[PDB]
Scaffold this active site. Structure first.
Site, short mmCIF file in Angstrom:
data_model
loop_
_atom_site.label_atom_id
_atom_site.label_comp_id
_atom_site.label_asym_id
_atom_site.label_seq_id
_atom_site.Cartn_x
_atom_site.Cartn_y
_atom_site.Cartn_z
N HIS E 61 -22.18 18.00 32.25
CA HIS E 61 -21.10 17.11 32.74
C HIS E 61 -20.63 16.18 31.63
N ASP E 91 5.71 17.85 10.33
CA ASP E 91 4.47 18.39 10.94
C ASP E 91 3.30 17.52 10.47
N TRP E 126 -27.21 13.95 27.53
CA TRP E 126 -26.26 14.24 26.43
C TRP E 126 -26.74 13.65 25.10
N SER E 156 -14.72 20.41 13.98
CA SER E 156 -13.33 20.36 14.52
C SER E 156 -12.78 18.95 14.32
N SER E 157 -13.52 17.96 14.82
CA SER E 157 -13.05 16.57 14.80
C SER E 157 -13.01 15.98 13.38
N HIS E 240 -22.31 4.82 19.49
CA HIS E 240 -21.48 3.64 19.84
C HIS E 240 -20.05 3.85 19.28
N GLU E 242 -18.55 6.55 18.89
CA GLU E 242 -17.99 7.59 19.76
C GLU E 242 -17.31 6.96 20.98
N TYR E 244 -15.83 4.08 21.25
CA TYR E 244 -14.57 3.46 20.75
C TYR E 244 -13.55 4.57 20.41
N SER E 255 -0.52 0.63 25.42
CA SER E 255 0.48 -0.26 24.76
C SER E 255 1.88 0.36 24.90
N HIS E 290 -28.01 -1.67 20.76
CA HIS E 290 -27.94 -2.08 22.19
C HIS E 290 -28.27 -0.91 23.13
N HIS E 291 -28.37 0.31 22.60
CA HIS E 291 -28.80 1.50 23.38
C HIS E 291 -30.34 1.62 23.33
N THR E 316 -11.02 -7.42 22.02
CA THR E 316 -10.66 -6.66 23.23
C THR E 316 -9.83 -7.56 24.17
N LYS E 319 -6.25 -7.79 23.28
CA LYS E 319 -5.45 -6.64 23.73
C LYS E 319 -5.11 -6.81 25.20
N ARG E 438 -31.63 6.32 36.16
CA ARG E 438 -30.76 7.44 35.73
C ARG E 438 -31.52 8.75 35.74
C1 HEA Z 1 -14.97 4.30 26.71
C2 HEA Z 1 -16.26 4.14 26.73
C3 HEA Z 1 -16.94 2.87 26.51
C4 HEA Z 1 -16.45 1.63 26.10
C5 HEA Z 1 -15.13 1.27 25.58
C6 HEA Z 1 -17.63 0.75 26.20
C7 HEA Z 1 -17.56 -0.60 25.84
C8 HEA Z 1 -18.65 -1.54 25.83
N1 HEA Z 1 -19.91 -1.20 26.20
FE1 HEA Z 1 -20.61 0.57 26.85
N2 HEA Z 1 -21.31 2.40 27.30
C9 HEA Z 1 -20.63 3.57 27.44
C10 HEA Z 1 -19.19 3.69 27.25
C11 HEA Z 1 -18.36 2.62 26.85
N3 HEA Z 1 -18.74 1.38 26.61
C12 HEA Z 1 -21.46 4.72 27.69
C13 HEA Z 1 -21.12 6.13 27.88
C14 HEA Z 1 -22.78 4.18 27.77
C15 HEA Z 1 -24.06 4.89 28.08
C16 HEA Z 1 -24.58 5.76 26.99
C17 HEA Z 1 -25.74 6.55 27.58
O1 HEA Z 1 -26.87 5.94 27.62
O2 HEA Z 1 -25.56 7.73 27.99
C18 HEA Z 1 -22.56 2.76 27.56
C19 HEA Z 1 -23.69 1.90 27.42
C20 HEA Z 1 -23.63 0.53 26.97
C21 HEA Z 1 -24.83 -0.29 26.70
C22 HEA Z 1 -26.26 0.20 26.74
C23 HEA Z 1 -26.87 -0.18 28.12
C24 HEA Z 1 -28.20 0.52 28.35
O3 HEA Z 1 -28.27 1.76 28.16
O4 HEA Z 1 -29.14 -0.22 28.79
C25 HEA Z 1 -24.31 -1.56 26.34
C26 HEA Z 1 -25.17 -2.64 25.83
O5 HEA Z 1 -24.68 -3.64 25.33
C27 HEA Z 1 -22.82 -1.42 26.37
C28 HEA Z 1 -21.94 -2.53 26.14
C29 HEA Z 1 -20.54 -2.36 26.01
C30 HEA Z 1 -19.74 -3.50 25.59
C31 HEA Z 1 -20.13 -4.91 25.31
C32 HEA Z 1 -18.45 -2.93 25.47
C33 HEA Z 1 -17.22 -3.70 25.03
O6 HEA Z 1 -16.50 -2.88 24.09
C34 HEA Z 1 -16.39 -4.10 26.29
C35 HEA Z 1 -15.40 -5.15 25.85
C36 HEA Z 1 -14.37 -5.47 26.92
C37 HEA Z 1 -14.28 -6.59 27.65
C38 HEA Z 1 -15.27 -7.71 27.57
C39 HEA Z 1 -13.21 -6.68 28.72
C40 HEA Z 1 -11.88 -7.30 28.30
C41 HEA Z 1 -12.00 -8.64 27.70
C42 HEA Z 1 -11.46 -9.77 28.23
C43 HEA Z 1 -10.62 -9.75 29.47
C44 HEA Z 1 -11.68 -11.07 27.43
C45 HEA Z 1 -12.52 -12.10 28.09
C46 HEA Z 1 -13.95 -11.60 28.20
C47 HEA Z 1 -15.06 -12.30 27.94
C48 HEA Z 1 -15.04 -13.70 27.47
C49 HEA Z 1 -16.42 -11.67 28.18
N4 HEA Z 1 -22.46 -0.21 26.92
C1 HEA Z 2 -15.25 10.99 29.93
C2 HEA Z 2 -16.46 10.86 30.40
C3 HEA Z 2 -16.79 10.95 31.83
C4 HEA Z 2 -16.02 11.08 33.01
C5 HEA Z 2 -14.55 11.13 33.16
C6 HEA Z 2 -17.00 11.16 34.11
C7 HEA Z 2 -16.58 11.33 35.44
C8 HEA Z 2 -17.42 11.43 36.60
N1 HEA Z 2 -18.80 11.31 36.51
FE1 HEA Z 2 -19.92 11.09 34.86
N2 HEA Z 2 -21.01 10.91 33.20
C9 HEA Z 2 -20.64 10.77 31.94
C10 HEA Z 2 -19.26 10.86 31.47
C11 HEA Z 2 -18.17 10.97 32.35
N3 HEA Z 2 -18.29 11.10 33.68
C12 HEA Z 2 -21.73 10.61 30.97
C13 HEA Z 2 -21.64 10.43 29.52
C14 HEA Z 2 -22.93 10.61 31.78
C15 HEA Z 2 -24.38 10.45 31.36
C16 HEA Z 2 -25.00 11.82 31.11
C17 HEA Z 2 -26.52 11.66 30.82
O1 HEA Z 2 -27.16 10.82 31.53
O2 HEA Z 2 -27.04 12.28 29.82
C18 HEA Z 2 -22.36 10.76 33.09
C19 HEA Z 2 -23.24 10.73 34.20
C20 HEA Z 2 -22.85 10.76 35.56
C21 HEA Z 2 -23.75 10.42 36.69
C22 HEA Z 2 -25.21 9.97 36.57
C23 HEA Z 2 -26.13 11.16 36.71
C24 HEA Z 2 -27.61 10.76 36.68
O3 HEA Z 2 -27.95 9.74 35.98
O4 HEA Z 2 -28.44 11.49 37.32
C25 HEA Z 2 -22.92 10.57 37.86
C26 HEA Z 2 -23.39 10.28 39.19
O5 HEA Z 2 -22.65 10.20 40.14
C27 HEA Z 2 -21.58 10.95 37.40
C28 HEA Z 2 -20.51 11.25 38.25
C29 HEA Z 2 -19.16 11.42 37.76
C30 HEA Z 2 -18.09 11.59 38.75
C31 HEA Z 2 -18.22 11.71 40.23
C32 HEA Z 2 -16.90 11.61 37.94
C33 HEA Z 2 -15.54 11.75 38.47
O6 HEA Z 2 -14.93 10.44 38.44
C34 HEA Z 2 -14.78 12.85 37.80
C35 HEA Z 2 -13.44 13.02 38.58
C36 HEA Z 2 -12.49 13.88 37.83
C37 HEA Z 2 -11.68 13.45 36.88
C38 HEA Z 2 -11.75 12.05 36.43
C39 HEA Z 2 -10.62 14.37 36.25
C40 HEA Z 2 -10.98 15.10 35.12
C41 HEA Z 2 -9.83 15.92 34.47
C42 HEA Z 2 -8.79 15.57 33.72
C43 HEA Z 2 -8.49 14.12 33.37
C44 HEA Z 2 -7.90 16.71 33.21
C45 HEA Z 2 -6.47 16.33 33.56
C46 HEA Z 2 -5.48 17.46 33.33
C47 HEA Z 2 -4.40 17.27 32.57
C48 HEA Z 2 -4.13 15.96 31.85
C49 HEA Z 2 -3.43 18.39 32.40
N4 HEA Z 2 -21.58 11.12 36.00
#
Ligand code: HEA
Ligand code: HEA
Ligand code: CDL
Ligand code: CDL
Ligand code: PEK
Ligand code: PGV
Ligand code: PGV
Ligand code: DMU
Ligand code: DMU
Ligand code: DMU
Ligand code: DMU
Ligand code: CHD
Ligand code: CUA
Ligand code: CA
Ligand code: ZN
EC number: 7.1.1.9
Lengths: 258, 91, 72, 227, 513, 75, 56, 40, 44
Positions: E61, E91, E126, E156-157, E240, E242, E244, E255, E290-291, E316, E319, E438
């Site tokens: 998934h 291009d 993953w 690829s990337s 991390h 990744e 961003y 935007s 932080h992970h 952030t 933005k 999890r």
């Molecule tokens: C698009 C994906 C994405 C993005 C952008 C982020 C953004 C951030 N993530 Fe997250 N994160 C994940 C995807 C993402 N993360 C995934 C996939 C994991 C799990 C990995 C795994 O274990 O599988 C995860 C796990 C993860 C952890 C590990 C937790 C754990 O495993 O125990 C932490 C720890 O600090 C973290 C923090 C943050 C923070 C601080 C941001 C910041 O960038 C967020 C900043 C944004 C804001 C704060 C909101 C807007 C701001 C305002 C409106 C201003 C005012 C706000 C304040 C004064 C607070 N995230």
């Molecule tokens: C991009 C990343 C992404 C997205 C979108 C999702 C979407 C969803 N995920 Fe998650 N998920 C993860 C990344 C994502 N996930 C990761 C990183 C983990 C952790 C894995 C691990 O623990 O190792 C995770 C784990 C995870 C868990 C925890 C499992 C566990 O700990 O046992 C669950 C549980 O409900 C869940 C559910 C779902 C559901 C119901 C959706 C739904 O919201 C999905 C609904 C469908 C969509 C959002 C549409 C998708 C398609 C398109 C957008 C194509 C569009 C077509 C055109 C543009 C032409 N996912």
């Protein structure tokens, strides 16, 4: 068209390269798990065919067809710099592994570096010679570059031949050191870090030597002008990269890690 | 101690066209940024084209981040829809 | 200039290689192999190697590389 | 343990878990307020026919947008780091217990005095006694003295696991070749439950932790009886 | 002709189209995996099997949604289609290498589906942590096929990043500085720099895992003096950045969408938006541990990673506030794309704020490896990255195709998906705070109510995904051809018509100084 | 003696080297005493501390390796 | 050796509509056919190998 | 945006067919697998 | 090459019913695959 950029003819090499990557990876899987080298040898063959034809076509486009305007050449310069950066970060992962293991040796090693039972190579013997060889090759390649800019065909070929000879000498010395080494890749994290880091470096030396040999034959065929020779510049940049990685390996693994 | 061809001897195709045009102070392949005129109806920016329309981008004031884009057509001068600067196509 | 880099190639770089070739030459010849001790952190085997009998490293040297059970 | 329809943390059993509840309350107020303000401002920007579409000057407003968030982050970080360093403070434990993760059960070692060790396995669903909790009970509980500072050391003899007890604020990864330390102090007697918190294969869901907190005298007699 | 055009492409638009088709197909695979997860969790007791088949599904998934859906759509699809048009370039810099970035993905995907078909699959997460991912606890080919899948996706990337950076630096009109490029172009340049620096470290780490599995190395095996925690540092040094990489192109699309449907010529605070994306990119490299707050690192290290992580909220927030200030005074058009973008601003903010909760190492002790983390990342991925993808898709579909969507159907689609994703993920906060771990196939009985509601949410989202397929069909079935597009003066990608000719900017734009 | 006291040499979560150091110190002490024909009772503190801290399987494996001649630490 | 670049410039600029990978003549077609045959045939073999490896 | 009227209009009945076929293409194969889980 | 709406894609939109079949097969195959993989794993 009234821009200076290169619209490339539709090409099969991206698809053949992608399929060669599938065959090499599925081939390594088949070798590691199903005791068979067949897919891997097909993938290596198709990868070599793809590289040959792709880079042949870039020479056709540039030397033979004149598509490499200054704007195109500037793009290629950025492309090669960015590729070298990506290779630096790849090696960084291996240096991180090395420092992680060596700075905090675990009880299984005897809590010391080098580990109990590891007899490192003397860094003042063949590893020092290897250092002198790659540094010397950085001097000779610079001579080759200046000879080419000054329009001197014979001295370019001599300097480039010397550079390639030194790359080959390094590779033969490293092959001999691999065979003579009393430790192996299976000798814990010492052998792991030593052979994977120096082995990826050795591969890059072979790649860089091959690139220099391509430049040698292109020079023999008069492809390069005194002002237009990006393939040579790219090979020289890559070659300096291989030198610098070696110096970091020498200081880190052979000297500080001994 | 010679034997290396020069660009003058061996450059070909578009590379050679660019090289020869630059010796003449000419820019048929759009390598250089054109210099603006005062942009009045009497002194319009002259926009070369190999056809009867070309896209113009107008950076209306120095350091604006927003570029204003529009097709300039053969005929009477047209004005930037943001700053009113005049452009005239010279096919 | 090309002249200066050729001067450095033949006057410094290749003489350095010749001196280090001499140095390696002089310190060559086989040093005695150490007593075998079956340390558990060495001669690692978690999966057979994909060549030979599965128990020999890729550039195995019988003189200096013992197997997990000792020298051949 | 958790209860049906639970919204927040398990009730605190240790002073540090109490601290974490008040710190979470403080942080959540801020999260609520910022979320609410963004939703409100969106709704405000979208509910007028009045327009202003010419270039707008950004530098004055960006001062507010950076300084106010910076202040808020400091107001979160100060209590956050106070708690982080409070958990790290020197305490002087009375007892050391080791736990070793395995596929798929925990072993426990109490070796301050005698060689006491045992394995702790989930009770299968088909063998639960009336009133017992599916997937949470074990055959052999981790008996410990209440109101005493305990050093827990955690490792693994196979893959990664993680030893967690939410009501005491505990989660320490179980890594082979590594001995990780945490401190455990229960304010109360009772039974405190946790679950393996690092993916460890086929029965990750099924290797729970049950602490049994009793007076020292009872702990001493249990210890003697387990030799 | 078909082979020359679609297998041998050197055209940025056709290659973009191939990426969008690939990503759409990958999205269906990822959605089916997500529904298998929620089908298991929607009732207590075992449905499918023990944790192995369950975690094969979870692992797949994640890899599918990240590597095969989000990155190919945002970077390969929107990036290839839009970046050259937005800078007036004819291009990409390396139009043949671009084609190989695309064609590496079908083989990468095939290796991932092979991983799941052989032996018992890769039930690793993953993150692929050893020793569970090693040759004792995951004997046989599955994890090696997963590693090779990641190698091909990485190449690829990396090549795509080289292509985008070179194109964006080298192929603008000569009068156009970097400070006159659109925000989407900046978002792709910054994403590409993150890819260039992060993926090689992943490549090193998974290569070490491959050699531990097959060549008797011991990088991660304590018996040889290795350390499983070293793998985690190498993985997260990539991981991390990744996340961003997953969001930045989304920020760039948001935007453009907010500006466009506000009737504005320009986003509020352009240079602040550029500053914010570069600050996020930079800070994204110094926060990875932080992970790892529960692995046993030193207190001062935990204090540093807490503090550095929280700092990301400042750029952030600039933005988020700048998007709100772009709406301010707008002539708002309530298009379907605008609804996706407004959903993004709010739901991304919620997920960012739960990230700030997690950044606190003391509280992360209790939240780590729980559903609180799952709630955080699905707000930012399933309601952030995905909402930016859907907004950009409905906004630019008429550019790419020359046909219009039915706006009423697109609004219905948005409404259903909004309900489904919120019903799915909001209750996972409660599961996390109350301690549900999890990667569990089954849970203690207390957690039943919220898991039941969460699973019901996932079925609503499935209904939305099925409707989206129908909506794309109805657009191609009806053939409503585009006539006029507003605001072309500040949206260059539209100025060559719908769809643009195969070759655009054969005669470059005129821009003077 | 209740348990191993706080040791400022090993103040952090990772206590691996604390177990290892006390195991080494006990066995070095035992060898130094048995050699002169002195009294291993002087080594008791190190024994209590390593027994408290060290996993049973680590001690058992290290003892086996000392007997085999494969223990990689200096005693 | 002699500089024959002008002769190659004439060959590769001939207005014959050939893409650059075939413009060298009949040898290019042969090497292309060998490459694509090994790629497509190897890919079919990799799929057979998956079929085989998917079952005990 | 402005657009032409549909070159090949899709009537309500045709939309019901497209929507039905689309939903069945997702639901029937998964349905068959999940129905037969006990048998596997 | 063909230019314009319906011509810049690798699939035909000439017939909306043939297109519905192609889209059904395309998206349906992706959605079905994981169910058939799970079935495959359960049947070992
Ligand atoms: C698009 C994906 C994405 C993005 C952008 C982020 C953004 C951030 N993530 Fe997250 N994160 C994940 C995807 C993402 N993360 C995934 C996939 C994991 C799990 C990995 C795994 O274990 O599988 C995860 C796990 C993860 C952890 C590990 C937790 C754990 O495993 O125990 C932490 C720890 O600090 C973290 C923090 C943050 C923070 C601080 C941001 C910041 O960038 C967020 C900043 C944004 C804001 C704060 C909101 C807007 C701001 C305002 C409106 C201003 C005012 C706000 C304040 C004064 C607070 N995230
Ligand atoms: C991009 C990343 C992404 C997205 C979108 C999702 C979407 C969803 N995920 Fe998650 N998920 C993860 C990344 C994502 N996930 C990761 C990183 C983990 C952790 C894995 C691990 O623990 O190792 C995770 C784990 C995870 C868990 C925890 C499992 C566990 O700990 O046992 C669950 C549980 O409900 C869940 C559910 C779902 C559901 C119901 C959706 C739904 O919201 C999905 C609904 C469908 C969509 C959002 C549409 C998708 C398609 C398109 C957008 C194509 C569009 C077509 C055109 C543009 C032409 N996912
Ligand atoms: C390994 C793979 C790595 C990739 C390398 C990339 C190479 C790119 C160069 C290229 O393709 O150009 C060829 C190409 C051949 O010419 P062309 O365009 O093909 O034909 C018209 C030209 O314009 C002709 O103009 P010209 O000015 O280029 O002259 C070239 C040629 C013109 O001749 C022709 O090509 C046409 C005549 C028909 C005969 C066809 C025979 C060629 C078949 C090639 C097969 C190679 C397959 C590779 C894969 C092998 C897998 C088993 O004239 C000759 O007389 C030379 C003969 C051909 C030279 C190439 C032979 C390659 C051998 C294989 C090496 C790989 C290993 O020439 C160029 O355009 C430049 C060539 C000059 C450089 C070649 C250098 C090769 C160096 C090999 C390195 C070995 C490393 C050793 C390891 C040690 C490390 C320590
Ligand atoms: C379309 C979508 C469909 C709906 C989706 C599913 C709906 C879920 C329904 C939840 C209702 C729960 C319930 O049984 O309510 C009775 C429950 C009985 O009250 P209680 O047992 O005295 O709860 C007080 C707790 O002890 C208070 O202390 P605690 O420690 O027990 O509570 C902490 C807890 C409690 O937090 C809550 O109660 C969540 C409130 C929901 C926000 C709306 O959880 C959280 O930390 C939630 C994390 C949320 C992350 C940030 C969300 C951003 C907010 C967006 C602002 C927009 C405003 C409009 O009433 C509520 O509090 C309603 C909720
Ligand atoms: C003179 C230097 C040149 C090196 C060339 C030699 C061998 C083949 C190729 C090597 C490529 C480089 C690194 C790969 C990893 C391991 C090899 C390390 C170097 C080497 O050759 O190490 C040897 C072991 O080789 C072994 O296991 C052999 C293993 C052979 C199979 C290699 C498996 C490849 C792994 C896949 C690579 C992934 C790449 C990722 C790309 C990035 C994508 C994002 C050492 O011999 P030994 O007998 O143990 O000790 C010496 C005792 N007298
Ligand atoms: C046993 C080992 C097997 C492994 C496989 C790899 C082995 C060998 C690969 C050796 C690399 C050979 C590269 C040859 C490139 C020839 C084409 C060339 O050099 O093309 C030049 C352009 O540069 C360009 O494309 C620049 C092109 C640069 C690309 C090179 C990058 C190195 C490749 C790395 C490959 C894998 C490394 C990763 C391993 C982990 C052409 O422009 P000029 O030179 O200006 O000529 C024009 C003038 O004549 C006009 O007057
Ligand atoms: C376990 C096994 C897994 C291994 C899988 C291997 C993956 C794939 C198989 C690779 C097949 C490669 C075939 C050769 C590709 C040559 C690309 C090239 O040389 O691309 C050049 C651009 O990149 C440039 O310069 C600079 C960049 C050149 C990069 C070249 C090749 C990279 C290959 C691997 C890189 C990974 C890096 C490792 C570090 C993480 C040319 O760009 P084009 O668009 O062609 O032309 C543009 C025209 O104007 C030229 O006249
Ligand atoms: C141009 C297209 C048409 C050509 C197709 C290619 C045909 C090649 C088929 C041969 O297959 C080989 O069989 C060998 C034995 O039968 C294997 O060696 C294996 O067995 C050896 C001894 O039996 C071991 O020493 C090796 O380590 C081991 O890999 C080898 O792997 C495998 O490749
Ligand atoms: C957090 C979202 C709230 C958004 C607030 C945005 C505030 C924007 C105000 C800046 O625009 C100004 O408006 C003035 C006329 O009123 C003009 O005179 C002035 O030239 C202009 O710069
Ligand atoms: C252009 C199209 C591309 C060409 C595709 C060619 C495919 C045909 C290859 C023949 O297949 C081989 O069969 C051998 C059976 O004899 C296998 O031997 C291997 O398996 C044997 C099993 O008996 C063992 O003895 C050894 O490991 C080894 O010889 C080997 O793995 C396998 O490759
Ligand atoms: C998470 C994604 C999926 C969500 C749920 C999907 C909803 C299910 C749609 C219907 O699926 C069908 O259900 C039938 C039963 O209603 C099955 O017939 C089965 O039962 C019939 C009636 O008993 C028999 O006649 C058939 O032979 C037998 O296959 C049939 O195979 C299956 O395609
Ligand atoms: C005779 C020939 C002329 C090349 C030419 O101008 O066409 C010369 C010029 C430079 C020579 C090369 C350089 O002198 C360097 C090498 C010297 C070695 O002694 C022979 C091989 C060697 C690689 C030479 C081969 C060949 O004789 C070359 C290539
Ligand atoms: Cu043990 Cu999860
Ligand atoms: Ca269930
Ligand atoms: Zn203007």
């Amino acid at each position: 068209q009234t821009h200076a950029y290169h619209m490339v003819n539709p090409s099969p090499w991206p698809l053949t390269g992608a399929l060669s990557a599938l065959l090499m990876t599925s081939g390594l899987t088949m070798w590691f798990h199903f005791n068979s080298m067949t897919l891997l040898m097909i993938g290596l063959t198709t990868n070599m065919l793809t590289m040959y034809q792709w880079w042949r076509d870039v020479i056709r486009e540039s030397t033979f067809q004149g598509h490499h305007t200054p704007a195109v050449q500037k793009g290629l310069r950025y492309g090669m710099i960015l590729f070298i950066i990506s290779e630096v970060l790849f090696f960084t992962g291996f240096f991180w592994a090395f420092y992680h293991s060596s700075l905090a040796p675990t009880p299984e090693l005897g809590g010391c570096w080098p580990p109990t039972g590891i007899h490192p190579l003397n860094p003042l013997e063949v590893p020092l010679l290897n250092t002198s060889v790659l540094l010397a090759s950085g001097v000779s390649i610079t001579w080759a570059h200046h000879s080419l800019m000054e329009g001197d065909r014979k001295h370019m070929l001599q300097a480039l031949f010397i550079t390639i000879t030194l790359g080959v000498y390094f590779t033969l010395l490293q092959a001999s050191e691999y065979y003579e080494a009393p430790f192996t890749i299976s000798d814990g994290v010492y052998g792991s870090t030593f052979f994977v880091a120096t082995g990826f470096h050795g591969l890059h030396v072979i790649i860089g030597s091959t690139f220099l040999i391509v430049c040698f034959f292109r020079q023999l065929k008069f492809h390069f002008t005194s002002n237009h020779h990006f393939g040579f510049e790219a090979a020289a940049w890559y070659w300096h990269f291989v030198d610098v990685v070696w110096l970091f390996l020498y200081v880190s693994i052979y000297w500080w890690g001994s | 101690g010679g034997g290396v061809p020069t660009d003058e001897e061996q450059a070909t195709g578009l590379e050679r066209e660019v090289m020869l045009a630059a010796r003449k102070g000419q820019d048929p392949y759009n390598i250089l940024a054109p210099k603006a005129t005062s942009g009045t109806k009497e002194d319009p920016n002259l926009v070369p084209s190999i056809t009867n329309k070309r896209i113009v981008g107008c950076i209306c004031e120095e350091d604006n981040s927003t570029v204003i884009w529009f097709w300039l057509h053969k005929g009477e001068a047209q004005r930037c829809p943001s700053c009113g600067t005049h452009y005239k196509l010279v096919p | 200039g090309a002249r200066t880099w050729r001067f450095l190639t033949f006057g410094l770089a290749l003489p350095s290689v010749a001196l280090c070739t001499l140095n390696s030459w002089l310190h060559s010849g086989h040093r005695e192999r150490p007593a075998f001790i079956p340390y558990h952190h060495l001669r690692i085997r978690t999966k057979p190697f994909s060549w030979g009998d599965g128990n020999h490293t890729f550039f195995h040297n019988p003189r200096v590389n013992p197997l997990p059970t000792g020298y051949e | 343990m958790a209860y049906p329809m639970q919204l927040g943390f398990q009730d605190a059993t240790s002073p540090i878990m109490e601290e974490l509840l008040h710190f979470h309350d403080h942080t959540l107020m801020i999260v609520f307020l910022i979320s609410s303000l963004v939703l409100y401002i969106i709704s405000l920007m979208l509910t007028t026919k009045l327009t202003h579409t010419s270039t707008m000057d950004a530098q004055e407003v960006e001062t507010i947008w950076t300084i106010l968030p910076a202040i808020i982050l400091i107001l979160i970080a100060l209590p956050s780091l106070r708690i982080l360093y409070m958990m790290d403070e020197i305490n002087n434990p009375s007892l050391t217990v080791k736990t070793m993760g395995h596929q798929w059960y925990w072993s426990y070692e109490y070796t301050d005095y005698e060689d006491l060790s045992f394995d702790s396995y989930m009770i299968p669903t088909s063998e639960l006694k009336p009133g017992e909790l599916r997937l949470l009970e074990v055959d052999n509980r981790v008996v410990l003295p209440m109101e005493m500072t305990i050093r827990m050391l955690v490792s693994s003899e196979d893959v990664l696991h993680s030893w967690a007890v939410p009501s005491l604020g505990l989660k320490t990864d179980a890594i082979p070749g590594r001995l990780n330390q945490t401190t455990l102090m229960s304010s109360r007697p009772g039974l405190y439950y946790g679950q393996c918190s690092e993916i460890c294969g086929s029965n990750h869901s099924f290797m729970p932790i049950v602490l049994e907190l009793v007076p020292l005298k009872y702990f001493e007699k249990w210890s003697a009886s387990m030799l | 002709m078909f082979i020359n055009r679609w297998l041998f492409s050197t055209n940025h638009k056709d290659i973009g189209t191939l990426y969008l088709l690939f990503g759409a197909w990958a999205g269906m695979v990822g959605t089916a995996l997500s529904l298998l997860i929620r089908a298991e969790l929607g009732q207590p007791g075992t449905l499918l099997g023990d944790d192995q088949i369950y975690n094969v599904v979870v692992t797949a998934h994640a890899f599918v949604m990240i590597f095969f859906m989000v990155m190919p759509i945002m970077i390969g699809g929107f990036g290839n289609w839009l970046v050259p048009l937005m800078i007036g370039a004819p291009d990409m810099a390396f139009p043949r290498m671009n084609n190989m970035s695309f064609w590496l993905l079908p083989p990468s995907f095939l290796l991932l589906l092979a991983s799941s078909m052989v032996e018992a699959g890769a039930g690793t997460g993953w993150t692929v942590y050893p020793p569970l991912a090693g040759n004792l606890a995951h004997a046989g080919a599955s994890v090696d096929l997963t590693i090779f899948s990641l190698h091909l996706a990485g190449v690829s990337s990396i090549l795509g990043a080289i292509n985008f950076i070179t194109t964006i630096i080298n192929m603008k009109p000569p009068a156009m500085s970097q400070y006159q490029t659109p925000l989407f172009v900046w978002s792709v340049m910054i994403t590409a720099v993150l890819l260039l620096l992060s993926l090689p470290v992943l490549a090193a780490g998974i290569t070490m895992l491959l050699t531990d599995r097959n060549l008797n190395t011991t990088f991660f095996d304590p018996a040889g003096g290795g350390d499983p925690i070293l793998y985690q540092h190498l993985f997260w040094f990539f991981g991390h950045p990744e996340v961003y990489i997953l969001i930045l192109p989304g920020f760039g699309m948001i935007s453009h969408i907010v500006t466009y449907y506000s009737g504005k010529k320009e986003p509020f605070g352009y240079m602040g938006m550029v500053w914010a994306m570069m600050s996020i990119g930079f800070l994204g490299f110094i926060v990875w541990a932080h992970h790892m707050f529960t692995v046993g690192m030193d207190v001062d290290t935990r204090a540093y990673f807490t503090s550095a992580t929280m700092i990301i909220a400042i750029p952030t927030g600039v933005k988020v506030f700048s998007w709100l200030a772009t709406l301010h005074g707008g002539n708002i058009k309530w298009s379907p794309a605008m609804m996706w973008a407004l959903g993004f601003i709010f739901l991304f903010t919620v997920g960012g704020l739960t990230g700030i909760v997690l950044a606190n190492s003391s509280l992360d002790i209790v939240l780590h490896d729980t559903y609180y983390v799952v709630a955080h990342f699905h707000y930012v991925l399933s309601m952030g990255a995905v909402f930016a993808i859907m907004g950009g898709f409905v906004h630019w579909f008429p550019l790419f195709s020359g046909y219009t969507l039915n706006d009423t159907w697109a609004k219905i689609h948005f409404a259903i998906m909004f309900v489904g994703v919120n019903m799915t993920f909001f209750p996972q906060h409660f599961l996390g705070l109350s301690g549900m771990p999890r990667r569990y196939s089954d849970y203690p009985d207390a957690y039943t109510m919220w898991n039941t509601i969460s699973s019901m949410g996932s079925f609503i989202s499935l209904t939305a995904v099925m409707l989206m397929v129908f909506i794309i069909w109805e657009a191609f079935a009806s053939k409503r051809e585009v006539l006029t597009v507003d605001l072309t003066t500040t949206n260059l990608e539209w100025l060559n018509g719908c769809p643009p000719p195969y070759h655009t900017f054969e005669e470059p734009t005129y821009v003077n100084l | 003696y209740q348990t191993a006291p706080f040791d400022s040499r090993f103040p952090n979560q990772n206590q691996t080297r604390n177990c290892w150091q006390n195991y080494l110190d006990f066995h070095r002490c035992e060898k130094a005493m048995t050699a002169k024909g002195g009294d291993v009772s002087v080594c008791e503190w190190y024994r209590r501390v390593y027994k408290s801290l060290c996993p049973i399987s680590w001690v058992s494996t290290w003892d086996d390796r000392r007997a085999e001649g494969t223990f990689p630490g200096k005693i | 050796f002699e500089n024959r670049v002008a002769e190659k410039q004439k060959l590769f600029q001939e207005d014959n509509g050939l893409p650059v990978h075939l413009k060298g003549g009949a040898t290019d077609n042969i090497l292309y056919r060998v490459t694509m045959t090994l790629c497509l045939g190897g890919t079919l073999y990799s799929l057979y190998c998956l079929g085989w490896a998917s079952f005990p | 945006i402005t657009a032409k009227p549909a070159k090949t209009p899709t009537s309500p009945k045709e939309q019901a067919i497209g929507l039905s076929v689309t939903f069945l293409s997702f639901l029937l194969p998964a349905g068959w697998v999940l129905y037969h889980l006990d048998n596997y | 090459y063909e230019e314009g709406p319906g011509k810049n894609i690798p699939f035909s939109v000439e017939n909306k019913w043939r297109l519905l079949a192609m889209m059904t097969l395309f998206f349906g195959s992706g959605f079905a695959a994981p169910f058939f993989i799970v079935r495959h794993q359960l049947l070992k």
